[PDB]
Structures are given as structure tokens and as C-alpha cells.
Symmetry: C3
Subunit: 115 residues, 3 copies
């Protein structure tokens, strides 16, 4: 559909937007003092739950942009990603180090997925 | 339409691109000597201008990635965003810090919207 | 089509994703010891190859985001872009400097295109 659907949840930093059978969402860490692996692993779990609640799923992710605050955390974030990603159904994947909006975020994950 | 429409199509870039009922655009500030907050507001206003010319609006933006040159300007670009954004019609957002091309850029905003 | 097609679908990533008449891809350099001009020119050549394998072309690219590891490489990557881009058929473009996963990468290029 060409009618935009927007979804706000109290426990969730980003809205979800659905349009033209496509879904956008940004995953942000919930446990600020946690390390990069935890934040990546738990943000990937957040994303699954958000996609499922709107019928989609981690199998239907088209493109993912992982922003990291520190180059030292690449290994940890690959380790989480690699434990979660669906073999043969993986999204196109962008990973860049950049400054994040909260100094305690080690990771932030933009998602575009099919609905 | 599955036909691609380009606005201000030059030799090396286009300013706006429209395809499959979706519009792409990067906004850059024109007020290059102003501060972050005021460069942001200016960018946002150009975006409104661009979206209105094609039939859309700031109520129909799907995703927005805000690049800041300096980590110290997060709070200020948020201030300019909250004055501009339409509550309950907000797009998904990304704000990160990276190097911009013109050294007088505090901010640069990439936009995907519906049309 | 509302079906998801993945090209070179691997364990942790897919090289290309195609959905809803839209194609997503991220080009990364092949020659790690090459300078930024070679890496950019070469990456634009890969993008073409990827687009035409799917029956699309570089005239059909909608949006491009170029990440450079070093601000000193801006001129080298514009020279490559300028030698390649299709006058009057260029996408929205956006260049920023950021940290990249491999320290030998001077450039990386994400592409959304019509297919």
C-alpha cells in the first residue's frame, strides 16, 4: 500500500514506518553500561521482535546499516551478527564507525525490510 | 511509476529523484556561516520546499539520516528537528557524526519520502 | 515483485538484494593497495557489472552514498565519479568521511537502484 503506517511504542526509541510494502526501523541499545557484543546482540533481538509484531521477520531484511562508535568494537559486533544472521537469507550489510547520539551507545542498526 | 523522474538533473548529480512512489533527496544548508541549530532549520526548510513542489510534505517522510560534523551539536540539531517535525507523523531517524565535504557544513540531511 | 531475490547469498551476507523493483548493493574495493582513485573507479565498474547482470544499468541508479576513510581523498573520488557518471541521469549523491571496516579501504559505495 501507498498509505503510510506509523507505529510508536513507549519502550522503544524509534518509530516503525511501513510504506509500499517496505519497513524502516532503527535499533538502539537499551542497556547503556553494557559492552558492544551485548548491545549488538540485544539490538538484533529487539529488531526481530519489532519485525514479527508487524508480521515481517529477520529473514525478510533487505539492507542493514550498522554504525559503530569505535573501531575496537568491530569484532564483537561481527560476533553477535554472526550468531543471529540467517544463512542464505542475509541482508545487504553496511558497517561504518561514526559518532553516535549517546556517548554510551556502542552500536546502532538501521533496517529496511520487506512486509 | 516504474519510470524514473529526476529534478534538476545536471552532469554530475541530480537534486531530487522520484521512482516507485518514493522520493530521494539530500539537503545541505545554504547559510554556511550560521550555527548548527540554524543550519539544520535551514536544511529542513529546503526539504519542505522540495517535498511541496512534488506534491508531498513533511508529513510523508519515511526515513531521515542526519550527518553532523561535530559531536557537540547533537542537542542543537535535535532542538531544530523538534520545532520542525509533525508529531505523530514523524519519520524514522538517524543522527550520527561524520566528516562533511564542505568545511563550513555543520549538518547534512538525507531523506527518503513518499509521493 | 514482492518476492525477495538475493544474489550471491552467503552465510553472513548477500551481495545484492532485489525487492519491489528496487535493488540494494554496497560496493567495496578489490585492490587493497590501490589509491582512492583506483578504488573508486574500480568500485563504480563493479556496480555497473552488478546492475547489468540484473538487466539494470548505471542510468537507473536512484541514490548513492560514498563513504571515504580520509577527507584528503575527496578529489580523487570525484575525479573517478566524474569520469563515470551519466550526464542527465545521475542519482542523488552524498559523500561523507567515516571509519571503514578494512583499514586498506579508501572508499565504499552504497547504491539503491531501479530494476
Amino acid at each position: 500500500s501507498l498509505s503510510i503506517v506509523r507505529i510508536d511504542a513507549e519502550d522503544r526509541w524509534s518509530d516503525v514506518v511501513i510504506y509500499n510494502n517496505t519497513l524502516w526501523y532503527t535499533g538502539v541499545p537499551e542497556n547503556l553500561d553494557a559492552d558492544a557484543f551485548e548491545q549488538t546482540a540485544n539490538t538484533l533481538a529487539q529488531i526481530d521482535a519489532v519485525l514479527e509484531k508487524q508480521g515481517s521477520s529477520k529473514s525478510r531484511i533487505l539492507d542493514a546499516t550498522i554504525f559503530l562508535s569505535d573501531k575496537a568494537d568491530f569484532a564483537a559486533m561481527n560476533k553477535a551478527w554472526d550468531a543471529w544472521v540467517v544463512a542464505g537469507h542475509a541482508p545487504v550489510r553496511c558497517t561504518v564507525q561514526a559518532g553516535l547520539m549517546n556517548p554510551k551507545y556502542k552500536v546502532e542498526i538501521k533496517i529496511v525490510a520487506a512486509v
